[PDB]
Design a protein around this ligand. Sequence first.
Ligand SMILES: COCc1cc2cc(c1)C(=O)N[C@H]([C@H](O)CNCc1cccc(C(C)C)c1)C[C@H](C)CCCCCCCN2
Length: 377
Amino acid sequence: SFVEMVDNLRGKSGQGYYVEMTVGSPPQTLNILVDTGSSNFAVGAAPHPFLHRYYQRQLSSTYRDLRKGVYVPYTQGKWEGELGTDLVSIPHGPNVTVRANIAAITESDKFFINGSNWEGILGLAYAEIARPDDSLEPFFDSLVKQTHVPNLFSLQLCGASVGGSMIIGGIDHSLYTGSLWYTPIRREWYYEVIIVRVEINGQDLKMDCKEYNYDKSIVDSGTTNLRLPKKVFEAAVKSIKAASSTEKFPDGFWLGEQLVCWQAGTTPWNIFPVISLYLMGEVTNQSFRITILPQQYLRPVEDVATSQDDCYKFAISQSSTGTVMGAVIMEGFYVVFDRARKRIGFAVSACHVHDEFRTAAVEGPFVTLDMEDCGYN
Ligand SMILES: COCc1cc2cc(c1)C(=O)N[C@H]([C@H](O)CNCc1cccc(C(C)C)c1)C[C@H](C)CCCCCCCN2
């Protein structure tokens, strides 16, 4: 019965993907951002200049106050509010209703986005990183406990405004081609994985593989960019510069600030390299790779000028909290969060990115010795 959930995600480029939900009795309809990088379910519950609507606890006969406060600080943005429970449904999801924890947002800073069309957030990661602590049961844990929905979901994020699918409870085989390749979830907090090798246009960056996972690597649909530890980021930017030195860009382009433009239809894709991330596999000494095209890490942005060119922002940036495989990496793959078997699956998406001579791919098997050493402690 998964066809009912195909295409249930919408979004604006650089502003996240959201699904429609209802909370309360009688149902109140809200758009909720889907975030595999956190674990709290929270919604606007007070007026805000950027909110079109919000949760009104006073109007719900099933609302229960938990009489405890809550705040969540993300990398970018933060909010505080009040904890409670209520009944929740997903119209274009399974046909069930769950009593879930809800953080009613009363104040926020740089969290809601002007004109975004979503009003809350659905954190799909594990209780270990929930606020105020791991005793606040996350929504997906409540769903699995209270219904017969299987303990897995899958995300098909389609690039550029944008759309996609969240398949809740299973895998829809019409959304990908080829084989699924699985990597272990290293620890159930973030969706943490282990990167064992990095190549750019087929050349090994030849770093200690611990650098790739210093201090962690996560799969995070709530972050736009590919974010890399300082040492890795500097190595990657240096290589992407050399491959594209045919042209020249402001150095503020490489920092993600200034955009670059070319005359419509003449973007020189062939001078930007492909990036291959190798992930730990399911059997001894085995890995697989996913390959990212420049059409994924050069994010298109509307030209703020009168000329209608093609303009892009560089969507790889530096991190001090580990690798973040963001939406720019997830787009063009079908990603299976197989919580029951503690693994994450990748396959070429049906809505894949089109280059002229190159193809995004998921390929294996590869042999990689000492993969266990690549994890940071
Ligand atoms: C270049 O980077 C800057 C950057 C860009 C972006 C997001 C974030 C940071 C961001 O912060 N996105 C966090 C994710 O949850 C982060 N997930 C990992 C994480 C990091 C710190 C603390 C936690 C806790 C709460 C578990 C979790 C979720 C966001 C508020 C969701 C609202 C905005 C969505 C559109 C913007 C996407 N673009």
